């Protein structure tokens, strides 16, 4: 239906505006509206329980609370055996994957991708593909994606065509296919229409991907340019970790020392993919030095 705007702003990263698109509805106790609102508020770091009445807006509070204690107790609890909507599940799947249970997470996702609620389904198709690729499952991601695609018709592709292209993108990003054409033009366009850290950072990745350390270099200097790292401190402090991680990899291509000072920031800061891999690899090496005495 209509909130094509609310959405088109969310998946491009500017919650500055994605929230203004929801303001245009005077609390229509709509689940789609509750979802993106609560979700957009979290993003702008201004979440505020949108009501404990809804057995969704309630899962939301539980999920937000979860994020602050890596504790799925009441979240997994207040959902078990109960037949809930994809939206309620999506929040559960993330909780599970954030914790590391990537296999029980894709299950949760599929469980709901294939049930009742007309609404919330495409939002899950994405989270399913994301959670699959995280867990390193490319073809399952592709299949989860292919089955849903070649089936569903023109209307779902209406509002959610954007939610879909995104998933298709992440698959292209791992598959490393059309990384220079179809895929590059995809992020290319997004940044030149929605200059967010999301769109930008994506583009930066397509450059690193492509060896364009030059263009890559630019996209970086720019993200340091006040317009982003000050005139947008908001959804910019949100992406700092991943951004440092991107700089490290760029810096490695140019053979720069920075490899260390830079990931000091991300280390003594976040514990994400790059640092997960970094400690993994760092240790596996010392494990080899012991080994050759």
């Amino acid at each position: 239906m209509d909130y094509f705007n609310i959405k088109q702003n969310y998946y491009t990263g500017n919650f500055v505006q994605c929230l203004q698109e929801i303001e245009k509805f005077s609390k229509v106790t709509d689940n789609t509206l509750l979802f993106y609102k609560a979700k957009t508020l979290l993003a702008l770091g201004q979440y505020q329980s949108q009501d404990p009445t809804s057995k969704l807006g309630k899962v939301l509070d539980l999920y937000v609370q979860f994020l602050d204690t890596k504790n799925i107790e009441e979240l997994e609890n207040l959902l078990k055996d109960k037949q809930n909507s994809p939206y309620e599940l999506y929040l559960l799947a993330t909780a599970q994957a954030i914790l590391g249970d990537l296999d029980k997470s894709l299950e949760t996702c599929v469980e709901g991708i294939d049930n009742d609620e007309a609404e919330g389904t495409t939002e899950l198709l994405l989270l399913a593909i994301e959670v699959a690729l995280l867990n390193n499952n490319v073809s399952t991601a592709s299949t989860i994606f292919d089955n849903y695609t070649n089936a569903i018709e023109d209307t779902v592709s209406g509002d959610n065509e954007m939610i879909l292209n995104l998933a298709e993108s992440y698959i292209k990003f791992a598959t490393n296919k059309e990384t220079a054409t179809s895929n590059f033009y995809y992020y290319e366009e997004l940044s030149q229409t929605f200059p967010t850290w999301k769109t930008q950072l994506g583009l930066l990745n397509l450059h690193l991907q492509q060896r364009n350390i030059a263009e890559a270099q630019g996209i970086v200097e720019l993200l340091l340019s006040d317009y982003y790292s000050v005139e947008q401190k908001e959804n910019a402090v949100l992406y700092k970790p991943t951004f440092l991680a991107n700089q490290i990899t760029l810096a490695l291509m140019q053979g720069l020392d920075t490899e260390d000072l830079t990931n000091q920031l991300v280390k003594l800061d976040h514990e994400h993919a790059f640092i997960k891999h970094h400690q993994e690899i760092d240790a596996k090496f010392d494990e080899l030095v012991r080994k050759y005495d």
């Binding site: 998946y11 979700k39 993003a43 994020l67 993330t94 994957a97 954030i98 994405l126 989270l127 994301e130 959670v131 690729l133 995280l134 390193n136 490319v138 073809s139 995104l166 992440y170 990003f173 791992a174 490393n176 296919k177 059309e178 990384t179 220079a180 054409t181 999301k198 950072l201 994506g202 990745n205 690193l208 991907q209 492509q210 060896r211 949100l238 992406y239 991943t242 991680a245 991107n246 490290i248 990899t249 490695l252 291509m253 140019q254 053979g255 490899e259 994400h272 993919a273 790059f274 997960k276 891999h277 970094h278 690899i281 760092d282 596996k284 090496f285 010392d286 080899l288 030095v289 050759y292």
Partner: protein
Amino acid sequence: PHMETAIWIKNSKLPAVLVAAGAFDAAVQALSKQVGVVKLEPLKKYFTNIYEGCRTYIPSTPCELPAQLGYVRAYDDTVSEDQILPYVPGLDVVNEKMNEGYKNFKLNKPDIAIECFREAIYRITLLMVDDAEDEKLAHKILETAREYILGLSIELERRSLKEGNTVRMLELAAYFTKAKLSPIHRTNALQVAMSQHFKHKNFLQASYFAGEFLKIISSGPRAEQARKIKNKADSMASDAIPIDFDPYAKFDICAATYKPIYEDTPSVSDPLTGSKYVITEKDKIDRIAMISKIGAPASGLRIRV
């Protein structure tokens, strides 16, 4: 060892790729049979950089989801699925580091310069190259790199002497002159030698070196002193202190003991560096880049895809 990774290991088993594919042991074992690599510690940073250098993360949608891994391949869409390999920073950077070396050589900081050449030797070791010109070149750089590590290691060992050892100190300042550096740089070696053999009334060398220098430097402040020194010296074929050094000979300087290895002299080489030592040093680590075993047999440095 995943969808992407497998392709790599399937497509090339050369160290650099093994490292990027996260298969460290496999790589350790290859550098061992191929270049005689034994001591691993000063090689960690290099395994790490290769690995992290071909991986990049793009943000996941709900931001508090962990980022998604993306691979950086060596070539583009238009290549045999056979030739799907990881991106490994190549020679652009090996030079960049070779220069830091030269910069530090002109500045007179051997420590910080040796540190650089060593780094370039390490990067060459885990390099990935496609052309044959580049493979030829990689070795050319490796050669030079060790000639500077060796030459400076000698100058350093010379500076580490307490007076009273002037016999050996004149021996070293002369051998430094034998390190196959580029002429522009060999100048500073000659000047050190030429001037120390002067100082100890050994104008038999003092003259030699100075001339050997003047024939690379027409005029200039320092070049002018070379002249004034070669004259005074030429007028008294003195032999203050005879040293184990024959300019009219063929020999290599032992990278460990810094004594000359003449053509008869039995010696052993270093599989990686190629530096030469006296038989005394067999089975110890090379001094040019504490990584390989001297004399251990190797099947060649594997750089090319």
